[PDB]
């Protein structure tokens, strides 16, 4: 369960930046974001919804600091869409992730 | 509702899954209702909901706050409809002090789980 | 609870003072119980909140949304106490349906509204 | 009418780019985030609080693009400290303003 579908709209759990085998990435910040959307993009295909259809991101980061850097990466994938809203929230992570994002998206 | 399941993505984590105080305020993980002995309390909701309750007052304590110091509580609920159930036991916690705001949230929780509760305290 | 007004600021605004529609979702103005006349309605919490629903239908159906794809509701009260008052009339407009997410806020409302409701919705 | 206190915490309203006399600032979406800035300094010292209290800013935008400027002026207000929360939230705007912020801060 990576999440929930609830009349047309995806609310997704967290992800994290491991790798669908299971292990954390290597790599500061920024490629940690880079793991996160990947796994994103992962789920979102599954529920029928995509980038383009995200109203609403929440952000986690273990460090308010490095807000920049995720949102380096934010950028990439949200170019040519930018959800309507979206959170930066201070969280304490699972063993060295730096960051962790959740989404909501309308199922297409 | 419906769950989404996939291969290509490692398992997710509950966003609230550890509490921080971060100036002054707590912000506890999502309480759900497991004993001690780490088993469920699989009764009905209002039961689940005195569960929460009672690890809230728990995490609250040991951060420094209180039920009286809790200004948010986020409610992760199966079905809506159950809501007035579990406001039904909310009101026996917050009675005289009752959050400057609450938000219900339809989610998928844990194996069983029919209520999962998280707040946000002024630590004292 | 206590008002806070300052001279060295402008008068506040309220940030749900007009609607939105952005990549399908319709993000609603704050909707207080003000009569087509313009008046302020007279009567207690429930008929005020009646008033509130019936200035919803009007923007979620003049948008392409209805009741039924309302996303999340915000109600702003100005004590807690009286949510139970606006829930009934909640329950009424969001019987078959409801809303996966709602929030219940303490907030100051313009002269004698003692509620307003925002929604979210989808625009299929 | 600029915001509420409740059991210790100042619950901003919406400050948008006015100056204190009720006039629209004229310049970039800078310098309305900066009028922006010095209105909640005046109601949050009212309310007994400051920038360094603040738990929570929500930033009401007109455009998301324009975030980036935006973020240059809130950092140079929460500099020595960041709120733990914020969000930035597409909004339709009392004409002229760009920009429009509430915060959440202990009193």
Same mark, same amino acid.
């Given at each position: 369960?990576?999440?929930?579908?609830?009349?047309?709209?995806?609310?997704?759990? !967290?992800?994290?930046?491991? @790798?669908?085998?299971?292990?954390? &990435?290597?790599?500061?910040?920024? =490629? *940690?974001?880079?793991? #996160?959307?990947?796994?994103?993009?992962?789920?979102?295909?599954?529920? !029928?919804?995509?980038?383009? @259809?995200?109203?609403?991101?929440? &952000?986690?980061?273990?460090?308010? =600091? *490095?807000?920049?850097? #995720?949102?380096?990466?934010?950028?990439?994938?949200?170019?040519?869409?930018?959800?309507?809203?979206?959170?930066?929230?201070?969280?304490?992570?699972?063993?060295?992730?730096?960051?962790?994002?959740?989404?909501?998206?309308?199922?297409?």
């Amino acid at each position: 369960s990576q999440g929930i579908i609830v009349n047309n709209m995806f609310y997704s759990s !967290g992800q994290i930046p491991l @790798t669908p085998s299971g292990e954390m &990435v290597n790599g500061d910040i920024k =490629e *940690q974001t880079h793991q #996160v959307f990947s796994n994103l993009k992962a789920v979102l295909e599954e529920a !029928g919804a995509s980038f383009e @259809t995200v109203v609403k991101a929440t &952000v986690f980061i273990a460090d308010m =600091e *490095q807000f920049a850097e #995720v949102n380096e990466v934010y950028g990439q994938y949200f170019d040519t869409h930018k959800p309507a809203r979206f959170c930066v929230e201070v969280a304490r992570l699972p063993k060295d992730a730096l960051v962790e994002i959740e989404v909501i998206a309308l199922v297409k």
